[PDB]
């Protein structure tokens, strides 16, 4: 029996706000400007209090002649107001800036804050790796002029999750983050991220679901009903896994002994034998195809793509990116760098092996940890104890990162930038600390 | 490749399967990786006769190659 997918259901209730009496001006504010979702709240709380995708609508009402503004979870109330959602992220950066100001105003309104002459709380901000000077300049402008905050500090979300899962701040490990739009590999030495050996592959969740979108467009060019981006996102989330060995799995997934079990049929919502032909297996699975059935031609068949699309991270040549794979880049980092002779692991490499951490938004795909453990056992010398740590939800460990950082006041003051330092040194200033970006030169 | 430690026997099985896409058509055979460990130790028992050792030392033309 084929399954039918839809859009995710809209929220029946709107998002509540925190009580204004519980606000104190001494507590900092933790924000995570992710490419997919926004996480906002205090520091003393450990559990999340505000998670919503970054979107905004300008709903023009006919009767009142007033442009209403719906932010984040308020966009998940009607289908028309969901479809007109606009993200501020254009590419891997931000381009429109006033949208960032009104979503920050929405977070400040929904945090239960009654401020005066701007926000009196220092803020904790995550930023992408090798961030371009213009957006951090504009960030300094908006926080140091629009919101009057006393202090600011910055860092990478992957290193922040690494510091969260290694709270001593002096450990050695190798972090891997699979973000919404980029995949990063950072070798960490003694609690400090070695960013001169960091590596980035231009693929993420957004490129993967666009790969699903144009793969489904190419596979069924005569499909009548255009399905939205959310359907592609949901069936990528629910019906995709990392293959344990892509060379051996691809030579048997088209057999009839797998297509009875490993084929997912997805029904679109609306109101000379075929056994020996692999076109009929690839398009219509192991069940015979009747072109006169109305429910039949509204169907996807996910047989090869479920193991094909997570393999783009391991081999970027499928996705068109002329880059080395995650396993090959990790081999380059681990076997020929940090004083490690190929064939003779240094103690830095041995310490990096035992603290391999996978985080990010795109670690939810099953079979990733077992596959990277299999590859690591494949290329390392025999007898090396390989440890891979994976969170239950690796999309929230960054907020745990700034929570543990601002709870640790001893090392919190090493990374902060006040109004006074910015005012004396301008926007062009780099604060060289362990858990953030370094200087662009030597 | 195949290396025996005690006698130094060298046998080339073939090129690895990961290097099978350097050319679309090639004269080399591509064998996969060995699924076991690199190092393999095994104790055998060899049974020979005295006539075999008599004929091993008494080759008139000369010793044969591998």
């Amino acid at each position: 029996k084929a399954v039918v997918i839809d859009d995710p259901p809209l929220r029946q209730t709107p998002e509540p706000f925190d009580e204004q009496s519980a606000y104190n001006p001494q507590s900092p504010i933790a924000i995570d400007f992710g490419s997919s979702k926004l996480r906002a709240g205090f520091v003393n709380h450990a559990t999340p209090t505000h998670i919503f995708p970054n979107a905004l609508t300008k709903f023009r009402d006919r009767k009142l002649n007033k442009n209403f503004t719906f932010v984040g979870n308020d966009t998940l109330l009607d289908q028309a107001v969901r479809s007109q959602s606009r993200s501020p992220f254009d590419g891997p950066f931000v381009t429109n800036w006033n949208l960032t100001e009104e979503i920050l105003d929405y977070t400040f309104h929904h945090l239960g804050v009654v401020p005066d002459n701007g926000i009196p709380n220092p803020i904790l901000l995550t930023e992408r790796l090798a961030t371009v000077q213009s957006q951090r300049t504009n960030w300094y402008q908006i926080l140091f002029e629009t919101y009057n905050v006393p202090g600011v500090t910055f860092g990478i979300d992957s290193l922040f999750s690494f510091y969260n899962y290694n709270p001593s701040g002096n450990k050695t490990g190798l972090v891997i983050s699979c973000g919404h739009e980029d995949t990063n590999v950072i070798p960490v030495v003694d609690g400090a991220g070695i960013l001169t050996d960091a590596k980035r592959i231009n693929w993420g969740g957004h490129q993967a679901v666009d790969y699903l979108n144009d793969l489904m467009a190419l596979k069924y060019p005569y499909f009548p009903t255009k399905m939205s981006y959310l359907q592609y996102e949901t069936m990528y989330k629910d019906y995709c896994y990392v293959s344990r060995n892509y060379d051996e799995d691809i030579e048997k997934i088209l057999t009839l002994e797998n297509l009875d079990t490993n084929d997912v049929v997805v029904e679109a919502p609306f109101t000379y034998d075929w056994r020996n032909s692999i076109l009929h297996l690839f398009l219509r699975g192991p069940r015979p195809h009747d072109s006169e059935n109305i429910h039949e031609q509204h169907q996807m068949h996910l047989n090869v793509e479920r193991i094909r699309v997570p393999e783009v991270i391991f081999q970027p040549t499928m996705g068109g990116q002329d880059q080395a794979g995650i396993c090959e880049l990790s081999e380059t980092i681990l076997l020929k760098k940090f004083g490690s002779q190929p064939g003779k692991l240094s103690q830095t490499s041995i310490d990096m092996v035992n603290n391999v951490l996978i985080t990010g938004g795109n670690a939810k795909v099953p079979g990733l940890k077992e596959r990277i453990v299999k590859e690591f056992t494949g290329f390392l010398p025999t007898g090396t104890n390989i440890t891979v740590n994976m969170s239950s939800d690796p999309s929230l460990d960054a907020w745990k990162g700034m929570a543990a950082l601002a709870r640790n006041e001893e090392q919190y003051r090493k990374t902060v930038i006040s109004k006074k330092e910015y005012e004396e040194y301008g926007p062009e200033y780099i604060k060289e600390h362990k858990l953030g970006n370094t200087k662009y030169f030597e | 490749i195949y290396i025996e430690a005690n006698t130094g026997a060298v046998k080339r099985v073939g090129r690895s399967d990961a290097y099978a896409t350097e050319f679309d058509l090639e004269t080399e055979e591509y064998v996969p990786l060995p699924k076991g460990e690199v190092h393999k130790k095994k104790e055998i028992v060899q049974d020979v006769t005295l006539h075999d050792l008599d004929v091993a030392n008494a080759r008139p033309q000369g010793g044969q190659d591998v």
Partner: protein
């Protein structure tokens, strides 16, 4: 006022900026830029 400044010209703007910095230094090795972290191509076929 603020120009829209799409992300397509931003990489070229940073490339021109870092080229300006290296040419003024030439008249200094980079450490961690956008074009230096970015991945080398695969050696295996």
């Amino acid at each position: 006022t603020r120009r829209h400044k799409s992300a397509r010209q931003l990489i070229s703007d940073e490339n021109k900026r870092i080229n300006a910095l290296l040419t003024k230094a030439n008249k200094l090795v980079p450490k961690a830029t956008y074009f230096s972290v970015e991945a080398p191509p695969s050696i295996r076929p």
